[PDB]
Inverse folding.
């Protein structure tokens, strides 16, 4: 319960601009599927999507935990979450894998 | 004589488990140990190589066993892939592909040499 | 016209054609006169050299020795007299059947095309016995070809039903142009300007067509490319054209995916199912994957079981009491010795030929083969009351255990190996399988069955015992104390025994010769004593002189 | 062991409704449509973060 | 006792089975020769 | 070394295909 | 060996511990009625 009371979640409620296709807004979602604040008018809500993922298909089954984190959060909460709530020891290396999308 | 030591250690298990099952006292004095067994059973009722693991210990035992299966199968695959027969097989199949691709490269190079001669004639 | 190809391209084309023909029982509509791709078909069947119809549709007026073919119900002589300057062409000499299309003329083509197309369509409207797709299905292989190849490609794709077309590139002419277009077509007509101009100039110059008809053949090609979902290519670079033929077979069928997997099970080609049938978007119905799993298990198709598990069947959810009972009573697989063992066990406890082999009788068979005091979990009272009250309280907590027992009892060795790899309690499974396999070997040899049966069951034990020995070696090299704990812990699923006792019942002398079991036996032998050098003598002096015990080295707690 | 902590956006993932759920072991298959703009995640990463 | 007298068609399929066994035996011998190490080294060196 | 041969000869084949395309374009330019 | 075993036992399906049952059949002719004969 402490995971949902630490980070944040972002929902898209806005003017729904037409742009090219009027069904897709500036956020790109469906025009009826609603429900940064510049052109998207977001409101900072409590987080709701966190837990564990069961991976079926594509070979062996693997469990992978996930926490939806807003992009404007403090990194010390993420670090305390990763060391305490995920029980992962601090590594001796951080191999970033940045490349072509 | 080829099976001697294996039969000896099998008999070792048999006699070790048997003599673990025996009472403390020898047969001529086994009446006393039988009476102490009966007295202990009467005290408890009317009033060796089988450890019983707990749940988490069983969980890490199962995890260790799955690791051993995985490294065993990986080692068997590596021994098959480093066996001489598999190496000769994969070398010969790639050499098949070499002859095919090098013949194609030779034909393409002949066409390119003809095109270069025609381009030099055009210049 | 006669052409040439790469040698091993022709070799794997012939091998793929022969393999597809043997797997499907196909009729081969090769042209028949020995010029061009028909000469590659004659080299293809020379690789086979061993049914397979090769019904040729060749014109009568272009054949050589027309006077030889005259004769009513007579076995006429037809030699391979092929003059290099004659316009007439002799037929292919190992085609199984022939049809001579007679329009009355001689030395002119086009007398066979319409009859062949109408006969192919008339075959395609015939309903097949299996009826998995839409009647008898047709595939069209294309190698080289002129503008008539593009015309019959348009005739095949626009047909009702739309027969799929496989093209084989690496050969030139129209097939290479079709493949190079299909590599860069996207949604059929979505071709850029430079690629379209390059295709037009290779049509006009590389294959020496007229430039005035180049645009006409280009829009004919675009009309072909409007139905790109049935055009299938083959890129060589093992990986024969049989993969293409079949993918075309289950591609143009208008068939559901359970029937597709049933056909893939029937052909035993796992790779076709892997490439096409298990694809994204395929809507499998409720319990169709479980039914296909049951069909793969009863047919001894270990690779399809592996593929199904890799796509997700939830092995815990599939295995019920009724499913395992149907698995034991199946007969659509290799022969076993199970019926004789159930007969002997039911005779000893106290048979109709329609006897449904119950799981209780299977459990008593485990008690008979295991021997000693092994009580199978089937014959325990809780499972007996579950069986009485039902014939997740019908599922199994360790399904790979019972699948191991099922595969060992029904002589499916490769399935037993696969079920050994997957799951927990592996060394217990290996030792139980070793004892069970040796026990059915002894039961077969004592009753004087086939000696191959008893020999292969021994060999199966020996293999399972060798797996147990190598697993013990690996666990000993990794962690010694965890190897102790693995050897000497109570196995609730295997009648509350240990791995040592299961090895002892199996008379597995290679297992207890190993250093791990000897350390356990030595440690329980000396007990609480740390008596290390020259023991036995100190034991005797302890027994005879009880004050000598106080001078002995005892271990700590 | 080996952590493979992925930093992927939440809005571009496929089956966003599958990822909803508090402390629940949700189903997440490898349903990757070839025409969908959304991309499914890698199926054997040890951890994940949805931005 | 162990001399069954087969009819004509049964003899025909017995002969066909025997010819099949000769063909697969010779094919298997050719495949074992072509997968022998000495032949593989010979063709690789050539 | 045969592993390295297959890798380097595939690279040589791709480079030769690119060079043949460039030679065809140069002949078209002439 | 299958042909020799099949002609050896003849019409009998005597499978386990044969020979002893053959001797009890010879010495006791009522014991033949308790033997497993094969079908036609």
């Amino acid at each position: 319960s402490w995971i949902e009371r630490a980070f944040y979640k972002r929902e898209c409620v806005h003017i729904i601009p037409s742009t090219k296709d009027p069904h897709r807004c500036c956020c790109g979602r469906l025009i009826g599927q609603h429900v940064w604040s510049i052109s998207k008018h977001t409101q900072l809500s409590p987080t709701d999507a966190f837990g564990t993922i069961e991976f079926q298909g594509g070979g062996h089954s693997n469990k992978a935990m996930y926490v939806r984190v807003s992009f404007d959060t403090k990194p010390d909460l993420l670090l305390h979450l990763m060391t305490k709530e995920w029980q992962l020891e601090l590594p001796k290396l951080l191999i970033s894998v940045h490349g072509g999308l | 004589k080829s099976i001697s030591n294996q039969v000896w250690k099998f008999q070792r298990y048999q006699l070790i488990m048997t003599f673990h099952e025996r009472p403390v006292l020898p047969p001529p004095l086994i009446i006393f140990s039988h009476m102490t067994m009966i007295f202990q059973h009467l005290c408890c009722r009317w009033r060796g190589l089988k450890l019983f693991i707990t749940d988490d210990e069983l969980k890490k035992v199962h995890d260790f066993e799955e690791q051993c299966i995985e490294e065993y199968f990986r080692e068997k695959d590596d021994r098959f892939n480093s066996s001489n027969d598999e190496r000769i097989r994969v070398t010969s199949e790639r050499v098949e592909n070499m002859s095919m691709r090098l013949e194609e490269v030779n034909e393409r190079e002949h066409s390119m040499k003809a095109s270069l001669q025609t381009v030099d004639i055009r210049l | 016209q006669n052409f040439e190809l790469q040698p091993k391209l022709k070799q794997v084309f012939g091998k793929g054609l022969i393999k597809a023909a043997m797997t499907t029982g196909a009729w081969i509509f090769t042209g028949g006169v020995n010029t061009g791709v028909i000469r590659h078909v004659g080299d293809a069947l020379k690789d086979h050299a061993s049914k397979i119809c090769t019904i040729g549709i060749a014109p009568w007026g272009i054949v050589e020795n027309q006077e030889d073919l005259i004769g009513r119900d007579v076995v006429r002589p037809y030699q391979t007299m092929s003059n290099p300057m004659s316009k007439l062409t002799v037929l292919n000499s190992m085609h199984s059947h022939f049809i001579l299309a007679d329009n009355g003329t001689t030395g002119k083509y086009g007398a066979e095309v319409k009859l062949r197309r109408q006969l192919e369509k008339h075959i395609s409207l015939q309903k097949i016995n299996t009826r998995i797709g839409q009647g008898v299905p047709v595939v069209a292989l294309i190698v080289e070809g002129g503008p008539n190849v593009i015309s019959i490609v348009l005739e095949y794709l626009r047909d009702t039903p739309p027969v799929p077309v496989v093209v084989c590139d690496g050969s030139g002419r129209a097939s290479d142009i079709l493949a190079f277009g299909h590599k860069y077509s996207e949604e059929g007509g979505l071709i850029n300007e430079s690629l379209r101009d390059q295709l037009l100039v290779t049509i006009q110059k590389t294959f020496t067509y007229t430039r005035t008809q180049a645009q006409h053949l280009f829009i004919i090609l675009m009309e072909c490319m409007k139905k790109k979902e049935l055009i299938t290519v083959f890129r060589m670079g093992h990986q024969d054209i049989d993969l293409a033929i079949l993918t075309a077979l289950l591609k143009g069928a208008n068939a559901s995916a359970p029937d597709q997997l049933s056909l893939a099970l029937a052909w035993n080609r796992v790779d076709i199912a892997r490439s096409q049938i298990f694809i994204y978007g395929q809507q499998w119905p409720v319990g169709s994957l479980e039914q296909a799993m049951l069909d793969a298990l009863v047919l001894d198709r270990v690779d399809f079981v592996k593929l199904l598990i890799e796509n997700g069947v939830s092995m815990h959810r599939f295995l019920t009491i009724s499913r395992l009972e149907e698995l034991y009573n199946t007969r659509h697989g290799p022969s076993n010795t199970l019926y004789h063992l159930v007969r002997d066990v039911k005779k000893r406890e106290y048979l109709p030929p329609d006897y449904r082999i119950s799981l209780i009788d299977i459990g008593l068979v485990i008690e008979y083969l295991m021997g000693g005091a092994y009580r199978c979990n089937y014959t325990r009272k809780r499972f007996r009351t579950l069986y009485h009250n039902l014939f997740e309280i019908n599922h199994f907590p360790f399904p790979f255990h019972e699948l191991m027992v099922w595969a060992v009892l029904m002589k499916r060795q490769k399935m037993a190996l696969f079920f050994w790899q997957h799951g927990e309690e592996a060394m217990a499974k290996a030792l139980v399988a070793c004892k069970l396999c040796k026990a059915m070997a002894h039961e077969a040899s004592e009753n004087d069955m086939v000696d191959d049966i008893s020999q292969e069951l021994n060999h199966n034990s020996r293999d399972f015992g060798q797996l147990a020995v190598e697993l013990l070696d690996q666990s000993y090299k990794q962690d010694e104390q965890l190897a102790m704990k693995l050897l000497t812990y109570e196995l609730k699923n295997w009648s509350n025994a240990t791995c040592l006792q299961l090895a002892v019942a199996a008379k597995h002398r290679d297992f207890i010769a190993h250093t791990c079991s000897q350390m356990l036996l030595t440690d329980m032998w000396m007990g609480r004593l740390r008596m290390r050098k020259n023991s036995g003598l100190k034991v005797i002096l302890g027994i005879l002189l009880p004050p000598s015990i106080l001078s002995l080295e005892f271990k700590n707690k």
